Amino acid sequence: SKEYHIDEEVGFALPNPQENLPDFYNDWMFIAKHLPDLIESGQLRERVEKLNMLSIDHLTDHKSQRLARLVLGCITMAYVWGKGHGDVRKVLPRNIAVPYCQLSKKLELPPILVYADCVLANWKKKDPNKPLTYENMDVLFSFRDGDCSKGFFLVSLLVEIAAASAIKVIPTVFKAMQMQERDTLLKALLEIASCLEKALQVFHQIHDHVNPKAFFSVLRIYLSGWKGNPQLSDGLVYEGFWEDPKEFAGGSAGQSSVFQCFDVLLGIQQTAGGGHAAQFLQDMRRYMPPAHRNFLCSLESNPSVREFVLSKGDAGLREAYDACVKALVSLRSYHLQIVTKYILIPASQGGTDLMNFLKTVRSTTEKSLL
Ligand code: HEM
Ligand SMILES: N#Cc1ccc(NC(=O)NCc2cnc3scc(C#CC4CC4)n23)cc1
C-alpha cells in the first residue's frame, strides 16, 4: 500500500505521534496539557479568550500538523462544553477558531475533534523499546481527572493495531483473485479471519479501564458535537472564519477506517439501501483523513471478493469467506454488549437510536453470510 498512510505495525493509526509542538505554540499546549485543572477551576474559558492569534505557518511536517489539530480540538471541546454540566458557549473565539479552521482546511478534516485526532494521534509508548500493550502506553491529552479517556482511547487504539495484521493481507487477496490463485486466496481469507478473531479479545480490555458512570456522565459529554444537538441547535460560530454558525458531528468510531475497510473488502454493502445507518457511515468518511478516504475508495473500485467467491462453487472458499463475516459479527455483538453496559444502563439511572444503528449495521453484516 502506497501513500494511503497505512502503517504495517499500527495500521490506520499515526505511527509514533509527535508529543510536542514548536516553542512558537506553547500558549496552545500549556492550556491543552492542563485541561483537568483549567476546566475545574473555571479558568479555562478565559485563557482561551486571552490567547494571541497564531499562524499555522510554523507547523511544518505532517506529525506536528496532526498533534496541533489534537491540541486545538481538545481546547475547543473544553471551551464549548466547559465543566460538562450543560452551560454551553455557542461562539468559539477567533484567536483560536481561525488557526483551527485554517489547519483543518489544510488537512481536509472538519474543524472538530474526530476519531483520527483523539484515538489515532493521541498516544505514546512509555518505553519505546517495549511492545505495544496497554501497560506500556498512555494518551497525550485528557479532559477531566477520572474521565477514563485513557481507557476509552487506548483500548480502541489497541483494536486498530490488532486489525493492522489483517490489513496487510488485503493486497494479496486482490492479487490472488486477479491471478486466479484459489489456494492463495483461501489462505489469505483464513488469515484475515484469524486476525479479526484475535481482535475480539482485545475488546475485552475495555471492562478493566473504563467505568460506566465516568464514561456516560463525563467523557461522552466532551466528545459531543453540534450537529442535530439541541444545545447548539444552529451549530457553532467559528469567530472570523464563517459569520454563520456551522454544524459538525461529534466524534464517532463510525469514523474508524478499519471496520469500514473490512465491510468493503468482504462486499458487505454497509453504505447501500438508503437507511439512516447507511447515510451515517457515508458521511463519516469526510471525517477521516483524506488518505484513508482514498484507500476506502480504491478498495471499492476493486472487483468484489464476495462475488468471486460466490461464483466458483468452492465450499472451501465459501467457508473461509464466512469465517471473516462471522468474525465481524462477533466483534459487533460484543460491542453492542459494551454499549448496553456503558450507555443503556447508565442512561436508565436517546440511547435507543444509537443501538438501532448498531443493530442495523450488525444485521447487515450478518446477512452477508453465504
Ligand atoms: C465504553 C466503550 C464503548 C462505547 C460506549 C461505544 C459506543 C458506541 C456508539 C454509541 C456507537 C454508535 C454512535 C457512534 O459511532 O458514536 C459506536 C460505534 C462504533 N464503535 Fe464504539 N463504543 C465503545 C468501544 C469501542 C471500541 C473499543 C471500539 C474498537 C475500535 C469501537 C468501535 C466502534 C465502531 C467501528 C463503530 C461503528 C459502527 C460499526 O462499525 O459497527 N467501540 N460505538
Ligand atoms: N447517550 C449517549 C452517547 C454516548 C456516546 C456516543 N458516541 C461516542 O462515544 N462515539 C465515539 C466512539 C464510539 N465508539 C468508539 S471507540 C473510540 C471512540 C472515540 C472517540 C473520539 C470522539 C472521537 N468511539 C453517542 C451517544
UniProtKB/Swiss-Prot annotation:
Cofactor: heme b
Expression induction: By IFNG/IFN-gamma in most cells. Exogenous inflammatory stimuli induce the expression of IDO1 in antigen-presenting cells such as dendritic cells, macrophages and B-cells.
PROSITE patterns named in the record: IDO_1, IDO_2
Swiss-Prot/TrEMBL keywords: Cytoplasm, Dioxygenase, Heme, Immunity, Iron, Metal-binding, Oxidoreductase, Tryptophan catabolism
Tissue: Expressed in mature dendritic cells located in lymphoid organs (including lymph nodes, spleen, tonsils, Peyers's patches, the gut lamina propria, and the thymic medulla), in some epithelial cells of the female genital tract, as well as in endothelial cells of term placenta and in lung parenchyma. Weakly or not expressed in most normal tissues, but mostly inducible in most tissues. Expressed in more than 50% of tumors, either by tumoral, stromal, or endothelial cells (expression in tumor is associated with a worse clinical outcome). Not overexpressed in tumor-draining lymph nodes.
Compartment(s) of residence: Cytoplasm, Cytosol
Residues bound to heme b: 335
Cofactor note: Binds 1 heme group per subunit. In the active form, the heme iron is in its ferrous state Fe(+2). The catalytic cycle does not alter the oxidation state of the heme, but IDO1 is prone to autoxidation.
EC numbers: 1.13.11.52
Complexes and interactors: Monomer.
Protein name: Indoleamine 2,3-dioxygenase 1
Gene name for this UniProt entry: IDO1
